[PDB]
From a paper:
The respiratory syncytial virus (RSV) polymerase is a multifunctional RNA-dependent RNA polymerase composed of the large (L) protein and the phosphoprotein (P). It transcribes the RNA genome into ten viral mRNAs and replicates full-length viral genomic and antigenomic RNAs1.
The T1U backbone of TrC10 interacts with residues R637, Q640 and G779 from the fingers region. Among them, the T2G base of TrC10 has π–π interactions with F629. The remaining 6 nt of TrC10 are in the template entrance channel and interact with more than a dozen residues, including residues E620, R580, Y13, Y249, R747, S1155, E584, T551, R555, K570, E57, H229 and Y249. The twists occur at positions 3 and 6 in the TrC10-bound polymerase structure. We reveal that the polymerase prefers to initiate RNA synthesis at positions 3 of the Le10 promoter and 1 of the TrC10 promoter.
Author numbering:
A (entry chain A): 10 to 134, 183 to 661, 666 to 676, 690 to 1462
B (entry chain E): 128 to 241
C (entry chain B): 130 to 187
D (entry chain C): 128 to 184
E (entry chain D): 128 to 158, 170 to 201
Write the structure that this text describes.
Amino acid sequence: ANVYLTDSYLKGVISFSECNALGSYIFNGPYLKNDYTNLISRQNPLIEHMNLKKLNITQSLISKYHKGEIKLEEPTYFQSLLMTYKSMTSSEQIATTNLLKKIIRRAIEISDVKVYAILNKLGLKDTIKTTLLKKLMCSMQHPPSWLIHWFNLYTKLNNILTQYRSNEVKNHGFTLIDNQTLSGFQFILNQYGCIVYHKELKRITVTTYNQFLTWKDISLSRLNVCLITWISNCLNTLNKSLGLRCGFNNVILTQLFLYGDCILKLFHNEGFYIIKEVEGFIMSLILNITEEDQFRKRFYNSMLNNITDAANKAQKNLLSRVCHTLLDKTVSDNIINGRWIILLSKFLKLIKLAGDNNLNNLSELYFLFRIFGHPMVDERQAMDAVKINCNETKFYLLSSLSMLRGAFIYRIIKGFVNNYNRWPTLRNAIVLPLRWLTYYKLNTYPSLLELTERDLIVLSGLRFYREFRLPKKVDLEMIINDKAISPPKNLIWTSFPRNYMPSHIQNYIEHEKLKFSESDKSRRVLEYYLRDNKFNECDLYNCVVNQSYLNNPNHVVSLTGKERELSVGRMFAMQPGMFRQVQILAEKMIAENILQFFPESLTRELQKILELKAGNYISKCSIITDLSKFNQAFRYETSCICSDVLDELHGVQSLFSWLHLTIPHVTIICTYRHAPPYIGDHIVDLNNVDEQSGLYRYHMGGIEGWCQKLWTIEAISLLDLISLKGKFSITALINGDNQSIDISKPIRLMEGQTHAQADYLLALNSLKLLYKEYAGIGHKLKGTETYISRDMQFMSKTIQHNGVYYPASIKKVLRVGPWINTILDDFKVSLESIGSLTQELEYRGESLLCSLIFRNVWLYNQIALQLKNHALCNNKLYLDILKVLKHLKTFFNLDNIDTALTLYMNLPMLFGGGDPNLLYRSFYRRTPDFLTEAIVHSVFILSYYTNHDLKDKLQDLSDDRLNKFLTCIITFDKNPNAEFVTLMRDPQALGSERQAKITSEINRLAVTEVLSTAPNKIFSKSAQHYTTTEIDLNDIMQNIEPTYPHGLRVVYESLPFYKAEKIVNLISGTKSITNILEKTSAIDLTDIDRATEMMRKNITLLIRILPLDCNRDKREILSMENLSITELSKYVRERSWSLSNIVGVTSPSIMYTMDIKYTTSTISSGIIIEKYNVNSLTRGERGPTKPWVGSSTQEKKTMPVYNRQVLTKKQRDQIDLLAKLDWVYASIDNKDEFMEELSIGTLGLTYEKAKKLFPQYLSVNYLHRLTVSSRPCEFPASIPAYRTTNYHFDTSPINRILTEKYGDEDIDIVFQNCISFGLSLMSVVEQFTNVCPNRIILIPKLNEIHLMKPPIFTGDVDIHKLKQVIQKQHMFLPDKISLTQYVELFLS
Amino acid sequence: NDNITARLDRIDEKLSEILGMLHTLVVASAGPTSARDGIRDAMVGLREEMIEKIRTEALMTNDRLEAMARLRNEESEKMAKDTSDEVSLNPTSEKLNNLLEGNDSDNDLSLEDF
Amino acid sequence: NITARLDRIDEKLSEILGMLHTLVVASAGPTSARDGIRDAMVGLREEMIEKIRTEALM
Amino acid sequence: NDNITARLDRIDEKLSEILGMLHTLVVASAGPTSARDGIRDAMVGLREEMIEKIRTE
Amino acid sequence: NDNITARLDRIDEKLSEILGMLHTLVVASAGMVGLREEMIEKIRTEALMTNDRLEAMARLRNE
RNA sequence: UUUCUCGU
């Protein structure tokens, strides 16, 4: 049948409603709050709740509670109890200590291979070979009691969770009873509930599976923090610069976690109001350290006010809620006594002690925001707050509205001028005065300093024609998403359980279901679009132009609790399919057309953003304000006045104004499986349902997510008006919910004043003005949201000043465990996710060994100690891993399976290994090709077991382990299949079963078959012809002699199969395939065993890649004398694909081909790199040089002179793709007919007509300046932006040598990776030697250098197959350029 | 031709007073009607007239004093407190600051309490 | 002097145009969309004109 | 001269547009659910006459 | 020179009636057939001008 | 167990 797999991480919402309902049904009384939820749960319970209560142990527990032996308590109370376990015994403590010691020792053993490779490649200076790791292991012998406690708690909770998940996989409706795993505790954990009972303390509760996952994640996060801090301290003990930037004794951290749990327990669920201020408090200490006298005290006092007001509000809400409920006898006396002041003061003082007046410590303390857990969001309370905020009348001065609209108009005019060199076409040219008419005629614009309030008022009254165009064909990639939607107004009750609905409501639903189509009856986007049999391609366009969303009788907005959000409230909402289409279309057009007029929107890294942003007296300032609640302050009169500008520009009525035209008339209703509203009798529609705390009407406001870009651009216009009114410059960096301001205004400094006490006055005046105009425009932002600063910049929850970045690496790597970011408990995905998450430590905190050892700890845990407990298949992966270990031991001369496991862990993941991130990632992020990097990583790894200098290239050696490995990589049996289409899907693919298969390739088939039998004609035909189109697209270009994978990728992108396969790949990532249309959230056994066999084959890849007999049975092996790794990899790729010549993808590994020398000689011939800052520890200090972005070389193309705005984004992208096609395939025998029919099929133009539209390129080499989406565009260093500023680089000797040898020709190597590798290598040398080198030079190895001249293709693309593939996939082509659109491309 | 200038000074001054009326004109949002059940129009009227309407409960609004102050263009005490050069502390915050900046007298570094 | 004063009168009239147009735009609201007069208030647009044109030509 | 004539020859359309804005505001403001049907069927007649006029010529 | 004076008189009358319309507007909003017909005519002629502009590029295509 | 839930 179908199996239910439950996630091991919450990745969802802890729901107050379901917990209250379950507790109320179990204890026959109001459990959490006196709402209708408890009443309906006690009246007509759910089947799962009945099953949970009917258990004999549950009956005994409720009988004991009724007898008064035990008293009901709260999930927060038991969270505190679990955190302060205080129930360990000597036996389990010894076992946990031994397990942790073994884990640490094995991780250090695995790390030794990587470190030895790094060291002997760098030239610096039993089971462990390096003295550094020897000392590190000798120091990290006994983990401390706090570390052991956290590890033991996490291990016990994970054991309970994995046992429950395995049993749930085995059989459905399982409930796990475990009173033995945790001493003194008791768990009745199920998917629909988790009852925790403490026999010793006589306490009981009702919790949820999400709450249990949250507890486990809290334990895992504390374990991660403890491990990272312990490793950093042990590294810093032996080398100050080696470890992380922060320093903790971690007794303070453990006490801080305990005190946070105590605060939560004292304030019950409402304690997260207080907990929400930890990040702000850290920021307050940061400002105390950095800012001037006035700003620091202002923020400190204001936020003391904030914290105490939040605590008082939490206490009041707690007392109000707890009164008429079963928990009334639970409130601690210290809450009423007011003694919680002492506890909270202790918490803050210990937070400050953890900070230790150190900027790095405070900056990285931002993980406390996530350690303490997540609240159980109350839907009714947050919706009541939203109703109170939104359902109010806002009074505006007509002057203020005119100024805002005029500012938006001025932004539109400035953007149009700067982009298309002309004013937009506007109807009302007569309303302008003579001056503005002259500015219209002479197509320029005035500056802000030369513009006035009169000008803003005048510009308000303008009406434009069309400059932008609506896409006629709906964008399937835009609308298709795995997310969910809401049913219509008459079907909204289907989102509630049948038991919770009244009998007449159930009858109405059963009668109405037959009156609705199969599509809208669903609740998921995929099901809604697939079941839509009567789905016309031009449906969204027709709806938008007919305003069908306006006054729709079946429009209802449903809003559910946020996911993993500690912020109370923040209730995101859903909307039916058609209105969602309209909203997403409006957002897409805003982003792709108008957002180019507002560069401050920051649609994006932070650090670069900050770095281009960073990029008698002048007074500066800085204001940071929150905008999470802004969205609520925008009526029709303030948002649609600027939305009318976009409406006119697109020439469409009420497209961007749909919000405050249809949301007011719909009913805002709570929608959750355990939060139903009271209906009554004979009422079957929301418009007649009376409103209560669960639902309301007449929103008069915005919604989160929807129209965020519109409100962002309106805010930017508002700040431009602010700057005009205040006579100062603004450098806004608005992004998402956080807004950053940088006001600079020249002043005449009066006598006896420094730069201080004038920036403060500027800040106060600007804040008063800013407050005044937000009040006038509707927003009532308080002192809670905003604050002022002078030399500090805050955005995206990041800390920096003086150009030195302070990261949050520990927070980023907080949740790392066995199966993270995976679906169906995928092994390879978990490995990749662990690797990616652990890089962050060395990418942001500048610590190679800390990140590497943390990654090795968790990788070893997952491989050895967690594969045996896989949820789906019990032991198959572990058995296969054991087989691979024995195979590796037999292949090499490894003495022990322990060493075999170490080698497997260090072996690159490309050849079915166990190392997710290779060596190059530690020196430069992006690489041209992965095969060469994998090969060099494997060579360096094998250099541990085979003595190699790594400084003398690769002189042959007596040992034959590396020789055998390389020979076996070279020699294999070729089994090509669908080679060209596989290259077009992945230009770096190997094929012939010589690379790890990702889940998309396996799932593509099953996706095809499930899509073929779908009601939607478009998807049905696309899947029916999918195999034939696959064959045709594979053999379309089998005749070209020199195959170019990147040019093939360009062809594939240009052809309409790209969108269809994007949809297929998106569908392949869902939980269940062939069960999408079955109306069930249970994975099919077909999915289970297909994924299982794919996982087993991926695990058993090293065996096939490395046969024991190294294939050919002879003494002839790969001779290592004068061997080029680039040639090796190119030959491997060509042999694997059975292709005569593959060009353009083979690039040298810079790490291998660039040697390291710290002192010059008689010949330099190297990339000279020196540090400008003359000091030992350059880390944490900013230099005088521009940051090393490492962008690729700029291609040279000429923009054709035509009207850009009249062509849609997809049409322009396809035109650019065809221009790239002409650039790459200019030398084709069949080029004329190929491009002619390609243009006829795709666009509405011919080749001759479209040639003038094509931006003809000027670079003669398409192997060096091509811009394929499969090729990297930037080559940055591993170190962040600021650290790259401390060094200078020069490549003049390299230029001289490369011109002397094979000069005046392009080279395969990339110099951006060269510079990034040099900088990151200098940083790594500083880490490993406690001193940054004065000057470093990189001598290359010329045998890895190749001349990648542009080849002349010889062949004929099969026009018949190209016609067939376009005709079959005729439902995915972009908008054809009609004549009535093309004829205006050459006007003025 | 001073007669035409003298006779257009009148239209100039009445256009100026129309501009002043437009500047003093105020517009309200199209919020829900009284006792719900419908959508009220986005009514527009003279400034002081709608301060009188707000103070006479003609339109329900969460903000009365500060809305009135903003409409009449006067500095309100709430706005001054939000944009104060020095911000004070409520008694809870004063006690919190006293405990934070003072030496640990009780030294109640015990989880068994509270 | 007469030209400059006529120009300043033109600027005031431009301000009247702008303020009245802003009031027209802000005065539609959801109440006009519910009653189906927003299109009359703000004006017919090019997409609706194309819809009418293609309905005629069909 | 012609400058004053051109100036008033733009003032007349400026005032006409002010008139039109006042007309639409006053017909949309007054008449609670009374004239709304009038504007609705006026739009119906307008679209009918527009499509007929596009059919002609 | 009386043409300028007559133009000034008619624009004065138009502006005075404009002020009358603002006064009636604020009075009505606080607490029609010809006006409606005139604004239908205005929107109709605006739509006609826009449609003629669109037919300009239509004719340009048809060439 | 109105597809456990899973927005932009």
